[PDB]
C-alpha cells in the first residue's frame, strides 16, 4: 500500500529549490520520463520518485556544499521512498534535460500533490505506467 | 520640504544654490506677498516664537534663470503591535498603530528582520516591534512549544474585549508521522480560527505550526485552550478576556539595622503594563516592574540606604491607579545630656533609667515625657561631690552619659 | 605584443578554484583542447585562454550564487584578455571533459605559470597552434 | 613521593597504612627531627604558606615492625609574540613564550582567528595575542598602508637589538599594474629581509602586500625605513634599536574645590607596553594605559573622590622602571580669641584684619606669626568702653569674633 496519514509535504520546500538553483549550473543533463502515462493521480509521484533518484545520483558527484543543497531539496521529496515503488518498466524512455526543467518540474509535482498527499490512497501508483 | 515645528520655537530658515551671482528672490507666504534682501547664493526666512498663525505654505521664487521653492510648515500616540494572517500565503503581518509612523521590526529569539511581514514564523521566541519618536513598543507572539519542557502554571493569557488572540503551537518530531489540535474550553475550534505550517530540521526532522486566532475578542471567546499532538503531551493555556491592577495595598510596616541585605517587594496581576513610581521623602525613582510568571509580576526595590521612614509604591496603568504604604524602622543615643535633664533617642522606645551616687549607689526619681525621650530629675541634692549618670536602655543595646557635681 | 610588467597571477587563486569546485557538479561537460602543439612557453597560457573563455559561458547558465564564484574564479585569469589572442584554427579539436577537469588543469597552468609571467614575451603565444 | 608545591600554599600530607594499632611515629625533617603523634593507622605534617625554607627531604618512621618513608618536597611568564615566515609557503606564524603555555589567536580588524598560522595577512589590523593564567600579551604586525590616508609623524618603531623586525607593507590599486618597493637609510634591502604576496579584491582591485623583515635586529639595522608603489606614494617610518619609559617625573602638584570635573594625566613614549598602577594612601588601583597616536600614550586616572594628598604614578617594563608623585589640594574659623590676642585658621592663608573702634571706627596694628594665623594686638587703650573686633578673610568666606573692652 501507499498513503500518507500527516502531510509529508513541506510548505517552504519552494525555498530550497531556489536556493539549489542559485548555485547550479542551470544547464547540467538530467533525464525525464518521455512517456509516461497520463494518470492525474500518480503522474506527479511517478516523476518526484524519478527526480528523487536524480537527487541520489547528484549527490554523489556533487562537492561538499553543493552535497547539502541538494540533500536539502532531496529531503522535500524523500517520502515517496516510504512507498515500495516498483522499477520503472522496460517501456518508459527517458529524454535529457535541464536540471533546472527538472528542478522546476518537481516544484510543480508539489505544489500539486500538497492538497491530496493525505487524502488519497497511492497503492496503484507503485507500477509506473506508459 | 517637510518642516516640524516644536511649540513657539525661534529658528531660521535658509537655502543655498551652488551658483552665486546678481540673482533676486521674492517670499510667498501663506497667501499672502513678502520682500527679501539675502546673501551671495543663500537666501533666508527666520522665525523668533512660530504661532499657529505663524505656519504653512511658503514659497521662494527666484530670478538669476527663474526658479521657485515650497515649504510646508507643520507643528508638533504609540499603540503596541497587533497580528493579522496575510491572505495570500501562509504567512503573518504586524500592525502597529502610532503618530509618528513608526518602525516595525519582527525579532526572532538574537535575530532581527525588520520587514512588518513575516514568513519564517518557526520555532524560537517571536515578538514584533514598534519604534517611533515616543519609544518602542512589543507585543510578543504567544507561543505553545510541545516539543519544549512544561512551564505547568497553565499559563494566563490576558487581552481587551475587540483585540486578536493569538497562539501559536509548535511542536518537532524526528519523522513527519504527527498531527497538532486546538481545543477551547471543552469545546474544538472554529474552521476560520486555526491555521497549520510545516517545515524540516537538521537529520530530517520535521517542525509543525498550527497556529490559533481570533480577529476580535469578546466574553464568548474567553476560556482554556489545549494544543496537544499526535506523538506530543497535552500543554494548555487559559485566555482571560478583559484597565485593572491587583495587588495588596494593606501598607506593610518594616524595621532592620544597617548590616542586613533587603529588597522591598510588590506582587501584581494588573494589564495593560502599568507605570511604577518608588517615591521617598520627595525623592522619587522608577522600578524594574520584572515579572514572576507565576500569574503576576513582582516589582522591586533595594537601594533602601538604611534611610528610615516612608517608601511609597504608585503604580498606573491607562483606566486604573494604585499606591502602597511601607514603613521602615537602634542602640539609644543620648542626642543631649544638656542641663538638670537627660534625653536619648532609640527604637523602640528607650528605658531612662537614673542612678546618682557617687560602690556606685543609685537614686530613683524623675518625670518622662517623650522615638526620643526626655527624662529628667530636679537636681536638689542635699550631699555634693557625686557624679550621676544617665542610663537609656533598649533591648538592643545601652548607653550612658556622666554629668558632675 | 603580450607581456605583464607586474604580476597578474595571484597567491590565493588556489582558493577561489576549491570554493568554486564546492558547489559544483563536478561532471558537468565542458571541453578542452585536445591536440594543442607542446610549446612549454604558450602551453598554458593557450588552456587558460580556452578555460577563461569557458569561465565567461558559465556564468550565462549560471544561478545568482554560482555566477559569483565563476566570476571569481574568472578574474583569476582574465588578465589573458589582455592580449589579442587569435580566435582558434580550424585545426584545433575539442574533447568533452568533466568541469572538474578543466578547473584542476585551470589551477596546474596558474602555478607553472606563476615564476614565469612577468619575465617572458608571449607576442608569439597570440596564435594558437595545433 | 614527589611533591610540587604551588607558590606559599597551605596544605596537608597524610599517609595511612592498612593495619590501625598501637604504632608510634617519628618525623625527620631537612637536616633536623620533630615530633609527631596521629590517628588510627594514618599519621600527618600539615603547613600553612610553605616557604623555599620549608621545603625538601622530610621522612616519617614507623615502629610496631619497623617502617621508614621519604619525600622530596620541591616548588613550582608572559613573553609577547613574536613572528616568523613559514618556509613552507606565503604566510606568518606566531611564536608567543609562556608558563603556562598560552592561547595564540590572530585578530584581523574585528575578527579572531585562533590558529597560530595565518595564511589570510592581507589588510585590516592585524594583531597576534596570547592569552594564559598570567593574562594577553599582544604584538600588532606593523603596517603601512600606501593606500591608507598618511598619519604624517615619520612613525617610530622601537624594538631590543636581537628582536625580530616586521614591516608589512599594503597597497590597493584599481588594475595589476603597479609595484612596491622597500628602501633602508638611503640603501636598499638585503634578499632575506623582503618578501611579496598579492589578491585580488571588489570590481576586479589588487591588493599587494611587500613585508619587510629581520630574522635579529641590530645597531646595524637602525634606520629610516620607506615604502613607495608604483602607482602610490612613497611612506616611511624609522626604526629605533634599543626597554625605555620617557616622561617628566617633575612630580606635579594640584588643587581644586569639590564642585570641578578634573582627570589626573600622564604622557609617555615607552616600550615595551609598560605596567602601570596608580597607588594613593596605601590604596593602589590599575589604569587605563591608552594611547595618544601623537607619538606617545597618556595614561589617565579620574577617581580622585575629591580626596586630598599624594597621587603617584608607577609605571615600569621589562628592563625600566617609572614613578611621578601628584600633589592634591574652608572658611577661616577662629580657633580661639581668647585673651589679648585672635587666632584663625583656614585655606588659604587667612587674613587678619583688626578693628577697635567702639559708627565703627577701626584701628590698625598687630604682629602676625602663623594653616593656622595666630595675631595679636597690644590691648592697652588710651581710651575705654569699646569693643574690637577680629576679622579672619579667605577668598571663600569671612569669619569675626568680638571683644568687650
Known amino acids: ?130 | 520640504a517637510a518642516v516640524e515645528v516644536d511649540v513657539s520655537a525661534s529658528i531660521t530658515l535658509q537655502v543655498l544654490v551652488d551658483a552665486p551671482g546678481n540673482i533676486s528672490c521674492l517670499w510667498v507666504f501663506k497667501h499672502s506677498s513678502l520682500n527679501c534682501q539675502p546673501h551671495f547664493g543663500v537666501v533666508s526666512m527666520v522665525i523668533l516664537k512660530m504661532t499657529e498663525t505663524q505656519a504653512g505654505e511658503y514659497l521662494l521664487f527666484i530670478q538669476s534663470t527663474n526658479y521657485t521653492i515650497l515649504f510646508t510648515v507643520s507643528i508638533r500616540t504609540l499603540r503596541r503591535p497587533y497580528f493579522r494572517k496575510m491572505e495570500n500565503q501562509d504567512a503573518l503581518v504586524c500592525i502597529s498603530e502610532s503618530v509618528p509612523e513608526p518602525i516595525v521590526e519582527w525579532v526572532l529569539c538574537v535575530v532581527k528582520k525588520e520587514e512588518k511581514v513575516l514568513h519564517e514564523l518557526f520555532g524560537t521566541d517571536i515578538r514584533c516591534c514598534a519604534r517611533n519618536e515616543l519609544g518602542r513598543e512589543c507585543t510578543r507572539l504567544f507561543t505553545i512549544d510541545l516539543n519544549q519542557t512544561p512551564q505547568t502554571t497553565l499559563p494566563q493569557l490576558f487581552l481587551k474585549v475587540g483585540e486578536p488572540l493569538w497562539i501559536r503551537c509548535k511542536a518537532v518530531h524526528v519523522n513527519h508521522g504527527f498531527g497538532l489540535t486546538w481545543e477551547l474550553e471543552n469545546k474544538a475550534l472554529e474552521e476560520g480560527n486555526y491555521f497549520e505550517m510545516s517545515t524540516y530540521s537538521t537529520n530530517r526532522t520535521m517542525i509543525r505550526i498550527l497556529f490559533a486566532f481570533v480577529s476580535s475578542v469578546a466574553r464568548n471567546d474567553t476560556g482554556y485552550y489545549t494544543c496537544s499532538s499526535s506523538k506530543h503531551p497535552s500543554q494548555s493555556a487559559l485566555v482571560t478576556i478583559v484597565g485593572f491592577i491587583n495587588a495588596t495595598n494593606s501598607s506593610e510596616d518594616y524595621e532592620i539595622d544597617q548590616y542586613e541585605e533587603f529588597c522591598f517587594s510588590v506582587r501584581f496581576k494588573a494589564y495593560p503594563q502599568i507605570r511604577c513610581t518608588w517615591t521617598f521623602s520627595r525623592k522619587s525613582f522608577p522600578c524594574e516592574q520584572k515579572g514572576l510568571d507565576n500569574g503576576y509580576s513582582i516589582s522591586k526595590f533595594c537601594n533602601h540606604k538604611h534611610q528610615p521612614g516612608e517608601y511609597i509604591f504608585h503604580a498606573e496603568n491607562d483606566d486604573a491607579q494604585f499606591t502602597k504604604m511601607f514603613t521602615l524602622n537602634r542602640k539609644p543615643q543620648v542626642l543631649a545630656e544638656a542641663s538638670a535633664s537627660c534625653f536619648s533617642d532609640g527604637y523602640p522606645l528607650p528605658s531612662w533609667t537614673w542612678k546618682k551616687c557617687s560602690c556606685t549607689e543609685e537614686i530613683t526619681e524623675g518625670v518622662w515625657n517623650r522615638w526620643v525621650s526626655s527624662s529628667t530629675l530636679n537636681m536638689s541634692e542635699a550631699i555634693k561631690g557625686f557624679l550621676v549618670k544617665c542610663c537609656a536602655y533598649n533591648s538592643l543595646g545601652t548607653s550612658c552619659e556622666t554629668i558632675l557635681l
Chains 1, 3 share one sequence.
Not at chain 1, 20 to 35: E, H, I, K
Not at chain 1, 48 to 56: G, H, N, P, T
Not at chain 1, 74 to 88: L, M, S
Not at chain 1, 94 to 118: C, G, M
Open chain 1, 1 to 130: 500500500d501507499c498513503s500518507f496519514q500527516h502531510s509529508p509535504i513541506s510548505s517552504d520546500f519552494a525555498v530550497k529549490i531556489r536556493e539549489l538553483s542559485d548555485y547550479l549550473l542551470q544547464d547540467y543533463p538530467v533525464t525525464v520520463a518521455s512517456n509516461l502515462q497520463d494518470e492525474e493521480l500518480c503522474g506527479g509521484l511517478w516523476r518526484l520518485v524519478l527526480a528523487q533518484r536524480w537527487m541520489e545520483r547528484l549527490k554523489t558527484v556533487a562537492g561538499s556544499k553543493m552535497q547539502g543543497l541538494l540533500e536539502r531539496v532531496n529531503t522535500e521529496i524523500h517520502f515517496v521512498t516510504k512507498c515500495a515503488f516498483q522499477p520503472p518498466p522496460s517501456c518508459l524512455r527517458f529524454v535529457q534535460t535541464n536540471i533546472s526543467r527538472l528542478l522546476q518540474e518537481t516544484s510543480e509535482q508539489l505544489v500539486a500533490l500538497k492538497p491530496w498527499i493525505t487524502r488519497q490512497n497511492f497503492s496503484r501508483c507503485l507500477e509506473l505506467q506508459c
